[PDB]
Every structure is written in structure tokens, then in C-alpha cells.
Design a protein around this nucleic acid. Sequence first.
RNA 1: ACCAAAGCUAGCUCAACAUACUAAACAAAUACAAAAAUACACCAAAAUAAAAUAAAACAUUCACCUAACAUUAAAGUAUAGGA
RNA 2: ACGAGCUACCCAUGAGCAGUUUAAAAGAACCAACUCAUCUAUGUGGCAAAAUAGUGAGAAGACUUGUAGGUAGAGGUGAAAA
RNA 3: AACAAACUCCUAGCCCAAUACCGGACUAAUCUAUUGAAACAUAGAAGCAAUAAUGUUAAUAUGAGUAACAAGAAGCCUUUCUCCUCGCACACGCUUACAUCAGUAACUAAUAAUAUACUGAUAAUUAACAACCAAUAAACCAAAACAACACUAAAACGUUUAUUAAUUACAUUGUUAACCCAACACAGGAGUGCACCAAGGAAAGAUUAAAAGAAGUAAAAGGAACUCGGCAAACACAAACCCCGCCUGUUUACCAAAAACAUCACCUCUAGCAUUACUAGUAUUAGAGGCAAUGCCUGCCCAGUGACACCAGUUUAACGGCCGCGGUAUUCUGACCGUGCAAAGGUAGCAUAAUCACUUGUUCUCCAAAUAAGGACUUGUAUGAAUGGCCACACGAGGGUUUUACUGUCUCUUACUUCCAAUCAGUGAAAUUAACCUUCCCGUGAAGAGGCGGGAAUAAAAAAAUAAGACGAGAAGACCCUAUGGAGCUUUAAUU
RNA 4: CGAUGUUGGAUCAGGACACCCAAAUGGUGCAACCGCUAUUAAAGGUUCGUUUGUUCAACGAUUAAAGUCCUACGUGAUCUGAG
Lengths: 153, 110, 51
Amino acid sequence: ISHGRVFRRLGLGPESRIHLLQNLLTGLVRHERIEASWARVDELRGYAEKLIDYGKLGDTNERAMRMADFWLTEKDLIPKLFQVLAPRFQGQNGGYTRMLQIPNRNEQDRAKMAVIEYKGNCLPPLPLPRRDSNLTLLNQLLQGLRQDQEASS
Amino acid sequence: AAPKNRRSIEVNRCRRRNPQKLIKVKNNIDVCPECGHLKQKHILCGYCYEKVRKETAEIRRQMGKQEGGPFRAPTTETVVLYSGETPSEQDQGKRIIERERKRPSWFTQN
Amino acid sequence: SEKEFVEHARKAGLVIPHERLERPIHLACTAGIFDAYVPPEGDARISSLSK
RNA sequence: ACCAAAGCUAGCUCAACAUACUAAACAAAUACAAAAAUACACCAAAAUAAAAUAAAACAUUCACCUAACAUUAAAGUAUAGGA
RNA sequence: ACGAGCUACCCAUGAGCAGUUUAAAAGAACCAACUCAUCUAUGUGGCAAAAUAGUGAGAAGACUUGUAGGUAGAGGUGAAAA
RNA sequence: AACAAACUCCUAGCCCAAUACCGGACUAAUCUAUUGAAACAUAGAAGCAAUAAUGUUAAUAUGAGUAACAAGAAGCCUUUCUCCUCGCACACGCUUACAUCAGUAACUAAUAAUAUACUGAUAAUUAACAACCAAUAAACCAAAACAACACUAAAACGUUUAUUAAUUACAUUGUUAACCCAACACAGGAGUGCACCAAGGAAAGAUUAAAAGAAGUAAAAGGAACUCGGCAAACACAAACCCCGCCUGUUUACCAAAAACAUCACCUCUAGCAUUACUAGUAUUAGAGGCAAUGCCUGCCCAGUGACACCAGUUUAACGGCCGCGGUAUUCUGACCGUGCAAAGGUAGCAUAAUCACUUGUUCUCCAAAUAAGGACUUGUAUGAAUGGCCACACGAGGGUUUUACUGUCUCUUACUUCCAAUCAGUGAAAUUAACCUUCCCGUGAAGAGGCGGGAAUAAAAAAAUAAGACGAGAAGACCCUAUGGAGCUUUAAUU
RNA sequence: CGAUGUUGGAUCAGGACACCCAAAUGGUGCAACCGCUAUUAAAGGUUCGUUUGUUCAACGAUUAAAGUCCUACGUGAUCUGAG
Ligand SMILES: Nc1nc2c(ncn2[C@@H]2O[C@H](COP(=O)(O)O)[C@@H](O)[C@H]2O)c(=O)[nH]1
Ligand SMILES: [Mg+2]
Ligand SMILES: [Mg+2]
Ligand SMILES: [Mg+2]
Ligand SMILES: [Mg+2]
Ligand SMILES: [Mg+2]
Ligand SMILES: [Mg+2]
Ligand SMILES: [Mg+2]
Ligand SMILES: [Mg+2]
Ligand SMILES: [Mg+2]
Ligand SMILES: [Mg+2]
Ligand SMILES: [Mg+2]
Ligand SMILES: [Mg+2]
Ligand SMILES: [Mg+2]
Ligand SMILES: [Mg+2]
Ligand SMILES: [Mg+2]
Ligand SMILES: [Mg+2]
Ligand SMILES: [Mg+2]
Ligand SMILES: [Mg+2]
Ligand SMILES: [Mg+2]
Ligand SMILES: [Mg+2]
Ligand SMILES: [Mg+2]
Ligand SMILES: [Mg+2]
Ligand SMILES: [Mg+2]
Ligand SMILES: [Mg+2]
Ligand SMILES: [Mg+2]
Ligand SMILES: [Mg+2]
Ligand SMILES: [Mg+2]
Ligand SMILES: [Mg+2]
Ligand SMILES: [Mg+2]
Ligand SMILES: [Mg+2]
Ligand SMILES: [Mg+2]
Ligand SMILES: [Mg+2]
Ligand SMILES: [Mg+2]
Ligand SMILES: [Mg+2]
Ligand SMILES: [Mg+2]
Ligand SMILES: [Mg+2]
Ligand SMILES: [Mg+2]
Ligand SMILES: [Mg+2]
Ligand SMILES: [Mg+2]
Ligand SMILES: [Mg+2]
Ligand SMILES: [Mg+2]
Ligand SMILES: [Mg+2]
Ligand SMILES: [Mg+2]
Ligand SMILES: [Mg+2]
Ligand SMILES: [Mg+2]
Ligand SMILES: [Mg+2]
Ligand SMILES: [Mg+2]
Ligand SMILES: [Mg+2]
Ligand SMILES: [Mg+2]
Ligand SMILES: [Mg+2]
Ligand SMILES: [Mg+2]
Ligand SMILES: [Mg+2]
Ligand SMILES: [Mg+2]
Ligand SMILES: [Mg+2]
Ligand SMILES: [Mg+2]
Ligand SMILES: [Mg+2]
Ligand SMILES: [Mg+2]
Ligand SMILES: [Mg+2]
Ligand SMILES: [Mg+2]
Ligand SMILES: [Mg+2]
Ligand SMILES: [Mg+2]
Ligand SMILES: [Mg+2]
Ligand SMILES: [Mg+2]
Ligand SMILES: [Mg+2]
Ligand SMILES: [Mg+2]
Ligand SMILES: [Mg+2]
Ligand SMILES: [Mg+2]
Ligand SMILES: [Mg+2]
Ligand SMILES: [Mg+2]
Ligand SMILES: [Mg+2]
Ligand SMILES: [Mg+2]
Ligand SMILES: [Mg+2]
Ligand SMILES: [Mg+2]
Ligand SMILES: [Mg+2]
Ligand SMILES: [Mg+2]
Ligand SMILES: [Mg+2]
Ligand SMILES: [Mg+2]
Ligand SMILES: [Mg+2]
Ligand SMILES: [Mg+2]
Ligand SMILES: [Mg+2]
Ligand SMILES: [Mg+2]
Ligand SMILES: [Mg+2]
Ligand SMILES: [Mg+2]
Ligand SMILES: [Mg+2]
Ligand SMILES: [Mg+2]
Ligand SMILES: [Mg+2]
Ligand SMILES: [Mg+2]
Ligand SMILES: [Mg+2]
Ligand SMILES: [Mg+2]
Ligand SMILES: [Mg+2]
Ligand SMILES: [Mg+2]
Ligand SMILES: [Zn+2]
């Protein structure tokens, strides 16, 4: 009975789970876009989002510093978190991460795959799904309705 | 526990041709507006994502060449440029990667 | 428990046994046409004229 | 429709004959731990065949059972046997 | 006829035994390497035609162990368990 | 009445069931003799006909796409991270499995990616290390142990002197490896020297987070109430008492490690001796045995059976034995009396025992409660003295009992992790299996029915779970009996 | 007998009624409380410990009561193995 369990079991145990996410996160902060097992990426996303929040607490905060010290494994990144990533998220509260499902891995294990990304990175943009345009027949029919909600008010 | 009798072919056909063991037809397949290959509706297009992946690889390669070693990563934002381009005033003060290829149609300048 | 398949068919051109042919290939014909006669460009309008 | 199926050859068997009976191949190496050119020694030998089995058990006995004399008969006779 | 390259017991010839405790290298003591195989759970076409995990017993001796040699079935060998 | 058969009529016939044994008539397919010539006839011959041997070989199913198997993460692709620690060399063994380039549709890897293991081509380990590498005389009693000097069990390892030893660059041979023995690229077995990391490696193919199973950590109050037993576990890692063996040691490789064996000690027997054992020894020695250190002891018997003495006679630390009936002290007992039989008549000790039964003997202690444990009583009429009897120290993975302590053993279970698990992808076994279109009840029946009778029930198919039945699978029952079937062992079996 | 694996526990219990408890009654050498009998009723219940391998049995403490039996002396392809 799994009721209300938020964290999925990975690795060799709870600790191995933390270290798996450690590596994933470090990879994410370095390269800013990575791809991995859909489940693991999903699991990661929360952490990846909170790390930016500790980053916003600034260099001088001790808690944030040893936090970043534990999570970012290659130490050289710790400045990047504080002096690059954390600044470029200022206005936005929670919007840091984009996560999409990629087609299943071509290897024989055929896994379920996801790409995860920090917004505002400098890379060729992911081919996101576009909503239909407004010129589409159905949407036009709705535009009619809208303008008649404006005309009747 | 060992089977008491050989299961006949009729019984067996009943088991393995049963509806629940058949592959189920996927109805969510569609065409990518871009390249006109196939994709499932809730998933990124494989072909397009390959374009992006290759280019990303090349960029990362060339930004590994600008870093003399494993542990040097910039303390500044970076921006990637293509043949016949120059850094904007807004984009200066940043790390600059210069690629030979002309800027791809899907990739915007931003 | 140890037995393998046979018969993977291959065509290998090699010049050495091709040279060792004891009865060299006898041709009834030559593959090309030596001199190609190149006709008049108005040969359609001279065809309705007999002489 | 897959998996499959069908061949007639390779050689063999049994006798006959036959000269006579250890084939072929030997450059080197071969009985050192065979195939390793070269140092004072040793070297060599023989003793009954037995039992399974039959006798409805088993105890004397039990044809043939790696010893040239064939064939037609005498004859399954004389004989021998826990007779 | 063939077998002692496993194993039983021998013969030659090598090799190991740290730390601690003791006047002591005393078939004493604690405890590794090493050697055994107590109890339990796994395992039971198994990792394994006898193992794994824990736990145990000995650990300068009637100790462990390498190499070469010996004893042969009416036999050998045996701190007898046929 | 009717309905109801291998009975009997009716219409036709080729005109009356059957197991072991017996008789008969035909006949498939081969071959041969003559025919024949779109596959036959008359004869003659035979390796002359397969639904049954846990038949043989090959091939295929079923079980089953089940059990089971594997590659730490990202990335700029061999760079960083996250973890775990059997490493380098030599000997023995293996024999090119090593190296470079290329290939991998399929073949090896229990799966891929790719390649130390599949395929092909081409190369390679170079002696200084190692192997190979004198005889005959003669002086030497004097351990290795940091060797000063000693201990007992008396100890591996060489100098010098003399006599001759071809005398003259370069001889020959081992040099790869991720390796060997286990049918496997096997969690097993493997000698030595150095190291504990500077070297080696990866527990997870991807998910999900059901049961049951495995492995772990934690647990309210209680603390052995669990149970054959505190087995296992534990924040405990302590004390006592019995039985048996003195002790360290040994044993049934693969169900027994013990109370069995050995053993110091003590005892019997047998030997007066020389070049292969015993022994290069000589009765304070050497063999054959018994018993089990120490301590107190080891009583009586030579009639039988042995063995000495070839007969007498001697031997029990040789095989082995060690009794009754009647009458008596006012009474139960029986010092005493009678008498029979024996070779001697069971002595000392110990005792309801690891000791036929009676037996849960009786009583005391221990517990709220004991067929347990301990202490006594004790004819044990079947104890008992080297096939040893009694005490005892120390010792014991031996077998029993108490106390403390500790605890999920239990009251009475619970939470969470990992492996299994279930889903996705790859590969893909096993016993088993007359055929199955494979229900329940009561009856029946080779005496316990899915299958018969009488009733009930009943669209068809997966996937997950449980084990009541299929007298479920395994192994031609090890128990039991039989066979004029075996073998091992012992003798007072018979032949020798 | 080309195997129908055997005692007692554990777990889960299915059934009978010849009722131990709970319910309704008849008779009493039934005043009352207790009891002793007999009829009817099987939905539900039927304890925890010390010793024994034990089933029985003895004993301690209780209970509304601590039933008698059948089920391959129920149940080992679920466990135990003391006997
Ligand atoms: N000795 C004997 N056995 C018979 C006789 N009849 C029938 N049998 C036996 O009975 C059995 C078969 O009986 P059925 O099948 O003939 O009714 C077989 O064992 C068969 O030998 C007879 O007359 N004598
Ligand atoms: Mg006979
Ligand atoms: Mg016969
Ligand atoms: Mg016989
Ligand atoms: Mg004979
Ligand atoms: Mg005579
Ligand atoms: Mg040997
Ligand atoms: Mg030492
Ligand atoms: Mg010692
Ligand atoms: Mg072990
Ligand atoms: Mg444990
Ligand atoms: Mg240990
Ligand atoms: Mg010890
Ligand atoms: Mg000890
Ligand atoms: Mg030998
Ligand atoms: Mg014999
Ligand atoms: Mg013998
Ligand atoms: Mg021994
Ligand atoms: Mg014995
Ligand atoms: Mg015996
Ligand atoms: Mg009729
Ligand atoms: Mg008739
Ligand atoms: Mg008839
Ligand atoms: Mg014929
Ligand atoms: Mg035949
Ligand atoms: Mg057939
Ligand atoms: Mg079979
Ligand atoms: Mg058959
Ligand atoms: Mg299949
Ligand atoms: Mg199945
Ligand atoms: Mg599985
Ligand atoms: Mg792995
Ligand atoms: Mg090999
Ligand atoms: Mg190679
Ligand atoms: Mg493969
Ligand atoms: Mg080497
Ligand atoms: Mg996992
Ligand atoms: Mg897995
Ligand atoms: Mg579970
Ligand atoms: Mg558990
Ligand atoms: Mg615990
Ligand atoms: Mg507790
Ligand atoms: Mg108890
Ligand atoms: Mg109890
Ligand atoms: Mg224990
Ligand atoms: Mg304890
Ligand atoms: Mg204790
Ligand atoms: Mg002992
Ligand atoms: Mg054993
Ligand atoms: Mg042993
Ligand atoms: Mg022991
Ligand atoms: Mg054992
Ligand atoms: Mg003894
Ligand atoms: Mg004495
Ligand atoms: Mg004594
Ligand atoms: Mg005596
Ligand atoms: Mg005498
Ligand atoms: Mg006498
Ligand atoms: Mg006494
Ligand atoms: Mg008795
Ligand atoms: Mg006696
Ligand atoms: Mg005696
Ligand atoms: Mg006695
Ligand atoms: Mg002592
Ligand atoms: Mg003890
Ligand atoms: Mg011992
Ligand atoms: Mg012991
Ligand atoms: Mg809990
Ligand atoms: Mg699968
Ligand atoms: Mg049906
Ligand atoms: Mg029935
Ligand atoms: Mg019917
Ligand atoms: Mg029926
Ligand atoms: Mg079942
Ligand atoms: Mg059964
Ligand atoms: Mg069976
Ligand atoms: Mg039989
Ligand atoms: Mg049996
Ligand atoms: Mg018997
Ligand atoms: Mg008979
Ligand atoms: Mg006989
Ligand atoms: Mg005799
Ligand atoms: Mg039977
Ligand atoms: Mg059967
Ligand atoms: Mg019930
Ligand atoms: Mg009644
Ligand atoms: Mg009542
Ligand atoms: Mg009831
Ligand atoms: Mg009965
Ligand atoms: Mg039963
Ligand atoms: Mg039972
Ligand atoms: Mg059963
Ligand atoms: Zn596309």
C-alpha cells in the first residue's frame, strides 16, 4: 500500500537514489539540457527547481552554500549556480524547468525517455509542440463568440 | 507441480490468440508539420529532435575547445554565433562560440 | 550441441584465377560499335522525297 | 506455405582362387618425460587356465572353450559317468 | 589389465605461523592469516553432483601446506567409521 | 392391456459369439525361375507385415514465450562524476585463447551496445633472470632459534688439502595472455613473495511499488508466557549444578564430531638375535594386545573352553563364571540351626542409573503448578570391580537442569528499505504429458468417480493469486514377503 | 508395493448431534439457592499455563462453558520433526 508516497524508489536504496539525483543534477547544471530515463528525470525535476531557489538566497547564505556544495558535485559549478543561473531567474517564481518526453530509447531496452532543461539556456531550441494558430477554423468560430461577448457588454 | 496432460493445440490457440494478448492498435499517431515524418501526439518528433541533438553536440564540442580542461566552466552567460554575425551590445560581456555553418532556419537569433 | 549453419554465398572478383584460365574466353562478337554513323539533321524531310 | 520429402552412389558382406603371410613410407629424429646427434655397462625370466553355466540346490562331474588331419561310414555303438 | 594427479598412510624434500599474554614456543591463554566444519537460515535440475550468509572449533602443533616417490583389489591403507 | 431383448417369426442371404492351446482357408511387400510389359500370372524362396517392450535412433510438440539470465550516471565519447574493494609477481598448469588492422547477416557472450573470448588477415615473447651446468681420496664429535649460551624431540644447508678434470668470442632451451581444476566466460578448489592502494573493480536492461518468499533496520506495555528445547534473535555477552568422557587430538569427503576411537599411565603375553623391514637396533630393547592419566582400589573361582605344558600340571589385568529350600529371638525380620548343590557361591563400592520390565518406585528440595533437574532411601533377584569399580582437578561447538541479564521467540503483530515480484524490451530451459470437448452432489463400482446411475449447474476466453483433489510429479518400495536369486560377516554348519 | 510418505503439534477448519455453554420446557426423594434427571433446539461459542515427543493423564489458575466425535486416527506439492 503506497498511499501518499511522493518519492519513487530508485537505485540500490534511498542513499543510492540521492546520489543518482546528485549526478543528474550536476549534469543538468553543467550542460543545461540533458536526457535520461523519464522516471528519473521526473524525479529530478523537483530538486532541479529547488536548487535555483537556494541559488537565489545568494552566495553569502551559509545554508544555501553547503547545500550547493553537497548537490553540485564538480565544485567548479558552484559559482555558475550563484553567478549565472540564479541571476537569470529573477522575475519568475517557479518557471525554471522545461521537461518533455522524447521518443523511446533506440537501444534494445526501449526505455521511456525525457529531456530536461533550464529555461533561457543558449542552445538550439527544443521543437516544442505548438498550439494551433488562431486562423484555424474552430478557433475562428470561437473568435466570433469572443467578439460577441465584447459587443454584448 | 507437473502438467498432467499435454495441452491440445485448440486450447493453446485459445490462449495465445486471445484479444488481450494481441498487439493493440495505436490511434495517437500523426505527422510532424515540420518534416512530415511520424510522431505520437504527446511526444517530441524524433527526426526534428535529431536535428537539434546533432547541432547541440557540435556546439558543445566547440565550447569544450574553448575550455582548456575538465573543471573550467564560465562564470558568465554564453551565446552562440554563426557565419556573418556580430555580438549585440546586449549580448557582449558573454562567452562567445563561433560556428562555421550558416544559422539554421529553425534556430532563431534572439 | 555444436553445429553451425553453412552456405553464405559471395561473389569474389579476383584477377589471379582470372589470369590462370587455361582456355581463354572465346568471343563470337565485340561489345562496341567502332564508328557511329551520324545522320543528316533534316533526314525527316528528305524521306518524303524519293530521289 | 513453412518445417520437411525423394533419389544411387560411397563402400561393404559372404565365399572361391592364390601365392605363401606383419601393407604403405623412411632424409633426419625416435625406448631422456618416444621423435632430444655425442661416455665405462649390467641384463634379464618362467607355475595346469578359471568361473558364470548344466545337474531344475550343490559339494564328484558339466560338450565347445585360441592345442593342425579332413571326408563317407563303423556310431551316438564299445565304453565313461553323484552309473 | 589399468588406476594412490582424488583420498588413507608412509618416504624424501621444501614452505608458513603476525599481534597480545606469560620465568616458557607449555600437545597453556586471547585473537588474525591458515585449517577445520558446530548450529541455523537460505539453496534443493542450485552459484555448487555438498554451495552461500551468519555463527562456531583449533590456531608453535598428534599443526597446516607445495613438489617428487611408494603401497593395488583373494589386495592396499585405516587414532575401526567396516 | 400396452411398451419392452443376441429369443422367435417375416423378406433376402455368403445360414449362427468367444480368452490359453489346436485346425483351416486366403493374403500385403520383397526376391528368384519362366510368363508378363500402364505392373502382372503359376511356382520357388525368405532379414516375409508393429496402436504398446519406463523399446533404439532421429525429429518434433506440451510444460512455455513460462522458470531463469544482464550493462553505475551524464557528457563534448572516452572526460568527469557516484560507489565497492583479493592487488602486482613467480611456481605449477594452460597452450596463442595475447598484439595490430578489418569484419560481425548468422555463429561464441546465457541479452544488447561492442569485442579479452566469435571470423579473417598480419604480426609476436630477443638473456643478464631460469633450466642445462665434475669425479676420487683426506681432515673435521660440537644444531637451527638476532646466538652471548643453552633446551630435548638431538636437528635441512660446506670448507680446505691432494690427484686428474677436453680450454677454444657468440651453445641449446622457458620468456604472449584477461590463462588453471571443476561439462559453462561456474558465488566452488588452488603453493609462495611482496603490498592494503599509488593498484584493481561496478550491487541497478527500463519501470511499477500488489500478495506470498528471501535479507535487513526499528518498535508501545510485557520479558520465555514461544517451543521438543531460549532454535533464531538480542542495548545481554554473566553465574551455578549434574551425566559421560580425564585432558590437546581423531572419525563416517556428501544426513551422525559424539558418551565412539586414540591417548599419557598401568598391565598382560611373544622373542637371546646381523647386512633391505623390525634394525645398521639387542630384554631399561622390540613386537602382539588389553585397559584408559592421577587418587582409593582391582574380592572369590582352573569344573568347562582355550593357551601354554606335546601327557600330568599351570594359567582369569585368558574366554568366562560367581546358588538355594526348610526351622528359629513374644511379633516382621533371622545373628543361630538343618540340609541340597556347586569350580567358586557377587566381596568392597555404587545404585530407580545412558542399567529388561514393574515405573510417572518412595520421600525431600526447586516451581502457583514438573512423568524434568538435584539429594537421599534402595534386592540392581537383569549393578559390580583392567570386556575395570568407585570418588576428583582441569577441559568439552557432548547431553541435561536451574538462576540473573537480554530480547519480535511469544502475547500480537507493525513500519520501511533491498533481492525476488508484476509490466515493457532481448534471449530462452525442466520434470511432465493415452486421448481429452478436463463441473458439483448423493448413489454405485477392483470396496474413496470430471467420465457410470439419479439429480443439479452451465455464453466464450485471458491475467493475478491459494494448494483441497487429479489415490498430483520424482525414484520398476529401502518396510514386508517370495525366488531351490545374490552377496558381506561369524562360527560349535558340511566338505577340505 | 513401476511408492495411497506414518505419531503428536502449528495454520485453517468442513460436518454430525449422541448438547459442554447460551435458549425453551417436563419430573423430582423440586420450599429457596444449588442440584439429579428427561424432552426440544446445532445460528454462535467452547481459556491460559507447569511436566510428558506425546494423544490420553496429573497438577496451577480461570471460565457462561473449557462437549463427544467424523473428515486418509481432516490438513507435511502450507509448516514442524520432539517421537
Ligand atoms: N485355466 C483356465 N483358465 C480360463 C478358462 N477359461 C477362461 N480362463 C481365463 O479367464 C481369463 C479371461 O476370461 P474371459 O476373457 O475368457 O472371460 C484369462 O485369464 C483366461 O486364461 C479355463 O477354462 N481354464
Ligand atoms: Mg545349477
Ligand atoms: Mg532353469
Ligand atoms: Mg543357484
Ligand atoms: Mg569349463
Ligand atoms: Mg565307478
Ligand atoms: Mg600422492
Ligand atoms: Mg605466534
Ligand atoms: Mg594452544
Ligand atoms: Mg562458513
Ligand atoms: Mg542475522
Ligand atoms: Mg569465522
Ligand atoms: Mg578460539
Ligand atoms: Mg580452548
Ligand atoms: Mg605416485
Ligand atoms: Mg568370495
Ligand atoms: Mg582387506
Ligand atoms: Mg587419520
Ligand atoms: Mg565399531
Ligand atoms: Mg557397523
Ligand atoms: Mg420388440
Ligand atoms: Mg438366433
Ligand atoms: Mg466359434
Ligand atoms: Mg507368390
Ligand atoms: Mg522382421
Ligand atoms: Mg511405426
Ligand atoms: Mg517419460
Ligand atoms: Mg514404442
Ligand atoms: Mg513455445
Ligand atoms: Mg505457468
Ligand atoms: Mg522472473
Ligand atoms: Mg551490473
Ligand atoms: Mg582447456
Ligand atoms: Mg585476438
Ligand atoms: Mg548474440
Ligand atoms: Mg609474463
Ligand atoms: Mg530497481
Ligand atoms: Mg533486473
Ligand atoms: Mg513483501
Ligand atoms: Mg522480515
Ligand atoms: Mg533489531
Ligand atoms: Mg518491545
Ligand atoms: Mg513453557
Ligand atoms: Mg505452550
Ligand atoms: Mg543461539
Ligand atoms: Mg546467553
Ligand atoms: Mg546470559
Ligand atoms: Mg573427550
Ligand atoms: Mg557426514
Ligand atoms: Mg574429515
Ligand atoms: Mg567436536
Ligand atoms: Mg555434521
Ligand atoms: Mg575410549
Ligand atoms: Mg597401580
Ligand atoms: Mg581408572
Ligand atoms: Mg578380577
Ligand atoms: Mg582349565
Ligand atoms: Mg585343569
Ligand atoms: Mg548411596
Ligand atoms: Mg529400568
Ligand atoms: Mg550381572
Ligand atoms: Mg574379562
Ligand atoms: Mg557389565
Ligand atoms: Mg589435567
Ligand atoms: Mg559443558
Ligand atoms: Mg576437542
Ligand atoms: Mg564436544
Ligand atoms: Mg510500526
Ligand atoms: Mg519477457
Ligand atoms: Mg468445460
Ligand atoms: Mg462416491
Ligand atoms: Mg447423468
Ligand atoms: Mg452424472
Ligand atoms: Mg492442490
Ligand atoms: Mg497424495
Ligand atoms: Mg505419486
Ligand atoms: Mg517392485
Ligand atoms: Mg521405503
Ligand atoms: Mg530387511
Ligand atoms: Mg522352490
Ligand atoms: Mg541358492
Ligand atoms: Mg565343523
Ligand atoms: Mg504399497
Ligand atoms: Mg503410478
Ligand atoms: Mg468448525
Ligand atoms: Mg437432541
Ligand atoms: Mg442450559
Ligand atoms: Mg459447533
Ligand atoms: Mg482409525
Ligand atoms: Mg492424519
Ligand atoms: Mg503429520
Ligand atoms: Mg496434501
Ligand atoms: Zn519533425
